Amino acid sequence: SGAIYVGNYRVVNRHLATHNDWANLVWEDSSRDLLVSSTTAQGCDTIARCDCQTGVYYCSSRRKHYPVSFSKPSLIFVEASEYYPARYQSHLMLAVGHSEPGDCGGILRCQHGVVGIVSTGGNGLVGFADVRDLLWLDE
Ligand SMILES: CSc1ncccc1NC(=O)N1CCC[C@H](C(N)=O)C1
Ligand SMILES: [Zn+2]
Protein backbone atom coordinates (compact mmCIF):
# COMPACT_ATOMS: atom_id res chain seq x y z
CA SER A 1 0.00 0.00 0.00
CA GLY A 2 0.89 3.67 -0.35
CA ALA A 3 -0.03 6.94 -2.05
CA ILE A 4 1.48 10.25 -3.24
CA TYR A 5 -0.25 13.37 -1.84
CA VAL A 6 0.45 16.45 -4.00
CA GLY A 7 -1.70 19.57 -3.92
CA ASN A 8 -5.33 18.50 -3.92
CA TYR A 9 -4.54 15.11 -5.50
CA ARG A 10 -3.94 11.57 -4.19
CA VAL A 11 -2.02 9.17 -6.58
CA VAL A 12 -2.45 5.45 -5.92
CA ASN A 13 -2.01 2.11 -7.77
CA ARG A 14 -5.24 1.77 -9.81
CA HIS A 15 -5.59 -1.88 -8.64
CA LEU A 16 -5.58 -0.75 -4.96
CA ALA A 17 -7.90 2.33 -5.37
CA THR A 18 -10.70 2.41 -2.75
CA HIS A 19 -14.46 3.17 -3.19
CA ASN A 20 -13.62 6.73 -2.03
CA ASP A 21 -10.87 7.13 -4.68
CA TRP A 22 -13.33 6.14 -7.43
CA ALA A 23 -16.03 8.50 -6.02
CA ASN A 24 -13.55 11.41 -6.22
CA LEU A 25 -11.92 10.29 -9.52
CA VAL A 26 -9.83 12.83 -11.46
CA TRP A 27 -7.99 10.49 -13.90
CA GLU A 28 -7.19 6.76 -14.27
CA ASP A 29 -5.20 4.65 -16.73
CA SER A 30 -5.41 0.86 -16.57
CA SER A 31 -2.40 0.58 -18.95
CA ARG A 32 -0.25 2.49 -16.38
CA ASP A 33 -1.82 0.99 -13.16
CA LEU A 34 -2.44 4.60 -11.94
CA LEU A 35 -5.47 6.39 -10.48
CA VAL A 36 -5.61 9.96 -9.16
CA SER A 37 -8.42 11.16 -6.90
CA SER A 38 -9.15 14.63 -5.41
CA THR A 39 -8.58 15.50 -1.71
CA THR A 40 -9.86 18.29 0.56
CA ALA A 41 -6.54 18.67 2.47
CA GLN A 42 -3.26 19.95 0.91
CA GLY A 43 -0.78 17.14 0.20
CA CYS A 44 2.66 16.61 1.79
CA ASP A 45 4.69 15.60 -1.38
CA THR A 46 6.67 17.26 -4.36
CA ILE A 47 6.99 15.58 -7.86
CA ALA A 48 10.38 15.27 -9.53
CA ARG A 49 10.61 16.83 -13.07
CA CYS A 50 13.88 15.26 -14.25
CA ASP A 51 15.55 12.36 -16.09
CA CYS A 52 17.16 10.66 -13.04
CA GLN A 53 17.72 6.93 -13.45
CA THR A 54 18.89 6.34 -9.82
CA GLY A 55 16.89 6.82 -6.60
CA VAL A 56 15.69 5.19 -3.40
CA TYR A 57 12.43 3.27 -2.86
CA TYR A 58 10.54 2.19 0.25
CA CYS A 59 10.02 -1.63 0.51
CA SER A 60 7.25 -2.33 3.10
CA SER A 61 7.99 -6.12 3.13
CA ARG A 62 11.43 -5.34 4.56
CA ARG A 63 10.54 -2.03 6.45
CA LYS A 64 13.56 -0.56 4.60
CA HIS A 65 14.59 1.82 1.85
CA TYR A 66 16.86 0.54 -0.94
CA PRO A 67 18.92 2.41 -3.53
CA VAL A 68 18.16 1.43 -7.21
CA SER A 69 19.27 2.03 -10.78
CA PHE A 70 16.10 1.86 -12.96
CA SER A 71 15.29 1.82 -16.69
CA LYS A 72 13.61 4.70 -18.56
CA PRO A 73 9.76 4.60 -18.61
CA SER A 74 8.74 1.98 -21.20
CA LEU A 75 6.07 -0.52 -22.38
CA ILE A 76 6.74 -3.78 -20.52
CA PHE A 77 4.91 -7.10 -20.70
CA VAL A 78 3.29 -7.97 -17.31
CA GLU A 79 1.82 -11.45 -16.78
CA ALA A 80 -1.82 -11.92 -15.69
CA SER A 81 -2.70 -11.40 -12.04
CA GLU A 82 -6.02 -11.37 -10.13
CA TYR A 83 -6.21 -7.61 -11.00
CA TYR A 84 -5.35 -7.55 -14.73
CA PRO A 85 -5.18 -9.82 -17.76
CA ALA A 86 -1.73 -10.40 -19.35
CA ARG A 87 -0.88 -7.06 -21.06
CA TYR A 88 1.73 -4.37 -21.75
CA GLN A 89 1.95 -1.82 -18.94
CA SER A 90 3.20 1.59 -20.18
CA HIS A 91 5.41 4.20 -18.39
CA LEU A 92 6.97 1.40 -16.28
CA MET A 93 10.61 1.47 -15.03
CA LEU A 94 12.38 -1.71 -13.84
CA ALA A 95 15.14 -2.14 -11.34
CA VAL A 96 16.87 -4.99 -9.52
CA GLY A 97 15.42 -5.11 -6.00
CA HIS A 98 13.13 -7.03 -3.67
CA SER A 99 9.35 -6.73 -3.76
CA GLU A 100 6.19 -8.67 -2.81
CA PRO A 101 2.59 -7.81 -3.98
CA GLY A 102 1.81 -5.76 -0.83
CA ASP A 103 4.80 -3.53 -1.66
CA CYS A 104 2.80 -1.67 -4.37
CA GLY A 105 2.45 2.01 -3.49
CA GLY A 106 5.94 2.36 -1.97
CA ILE A 107 7.46 5.63 -3.17
CA LEU A 108 10.58 5.89 -5.41
CA ARG A 109 12.34 9.26 -4.89
CA CYS A 110 15.43 10.96 -6.34
CA GLN A 111 17.10 14.21 -5.12
CA HIS A 112 14.37 16.22 -6.99
CA GLY A 113 11.29 14.61 -5.43
CA VAL A 114 8.85 11.79 -6.07
CA VAL A 115 9.54 9.80 -9.25
CA GLY A 116 6.91 7.06 -9.06
CA ILE A 117 5.37 4.22 -7.06
CA VAL A 118 6.02 0.43 -6.85
CA SER A 119 3.60 -1.27 -9.27
CA THR A 120 5.11 -4.67 -10.36
CA GLY A 121 7.74 -7.20 -9.29
CA GLY A 122 9.08 -10.68 -9.21
CA ASN A 123 12.26 -12.73 -9.04
CA GLY A 124 14.50 -9.96 -7.75
CA LEU A 125 13.02 -7.26 -10.00
CA VAL A 126 10.84 -4.31 -8.98
CA GLY A 127 8.82 -2.09 -11.35
CA PHE A 128 7.75 1.51 -10.70
CA ALA A 129 4.92 3.41 -12.36
CA ASP A 130 6.43 6.78 -13.43
CA VAL A 131 4.53 10.01 -12.54
CA ARG A 132 7.12 12.63 -13.75
CA ASP A 133 5.30 13.23 -17.03
CA LEU A 134 1.99 14.12 -15.27
CA LEU A 135 2.61 17.88 -15.24
CA TRP A 136 -0.95 18.75 -14.23
CA LEU A 137 -0.31 17.21 -10.72
CA ASP A 138 1.52 20.53 -9.81
CA GLU A 139 -1.33 22.81 -10.87
C1 LIG B 1 5.43 -5.38 -6.20
S1 LIG B 1 4.18 -6.32 -7.10
C2 LIG B 1 4.88 -7.94 -7.12
N1 LIG B 1 6.06 -8.13 -6.54
C3 LIG B 1 6.52 -9.40 -6.50
C4 LIG B 1 5.85 -10.49 -7.02
C5 LIG B 1 4.63 -10.28 -7.65
C6 LIG B 1 4.13 -8.98 -7.71
N2 LIG B 1 2.88 -8.68 -8.30
C7 LIG B 1 2.76 -7.99 -9.46
O1 LIG B 1 3.74 -7.68 -10.14
N3 LIG B 1 1.49 -7.70 -9.87
C8 LIG B 1 0.28 -7.90 -9.04
C9 LIG B 1 -0.46 -6.59 -8.80
C10 LIG B 1 -0.70 -5.85 -10.12
C11 LIG B 1 0.62 -5.62 -10.86
C12 LIG B 1 0.42 -4.85 -12.15
N4 LIG B 1 0.88 -3.60 -12.15
O2 LIG B 1 -0.10 -5.38 -13.14
C13 LIG B 1 1.29 -6.98 -11.13
ZN1 LIG C 1 15.66 13.52 -10.25
UniProtKB/Swiss-Prot annotation:
Binding residues annotated for Zn(2+) 1, in chain numbering: 50, 52, 110, 112
Annotated TM spans: none
Active-site residues, as the UniProt record annotates them: 15 (for protease 2a activity), 33 (for protease 2a activity), 104 (for protease 2a activity)
Coiled-coil features, chain-numbered ranges: none
Chemical reaction(s) catalysed: Selective cleavage of Tyr-|-Gly bond in the picornavirus polyprotein
Record note on quaternary structure: Homodimer.
Function: Cysteine protease that cleaves viral polyprotein and specific host proteins. It is responsible for the autocatalytic cleavage between the P1 and P2 regions, which is the first cleavage occurring in the polyprotein. Also cleaves the host translation initiation factor EIF4G1, in order to shut down the capped cellular mRNA translation. Inhibits the host nucleus-cytoplasm protein and RNA trafficking by cleaving host members of the nuclear pores. Counteracts stress granule formation probably by antagonizing its assembly or promoting its dissassembly.
Record-given protein name: Protease 2A
Species for this entry: Coxsackievirus A16 (strain G-10)
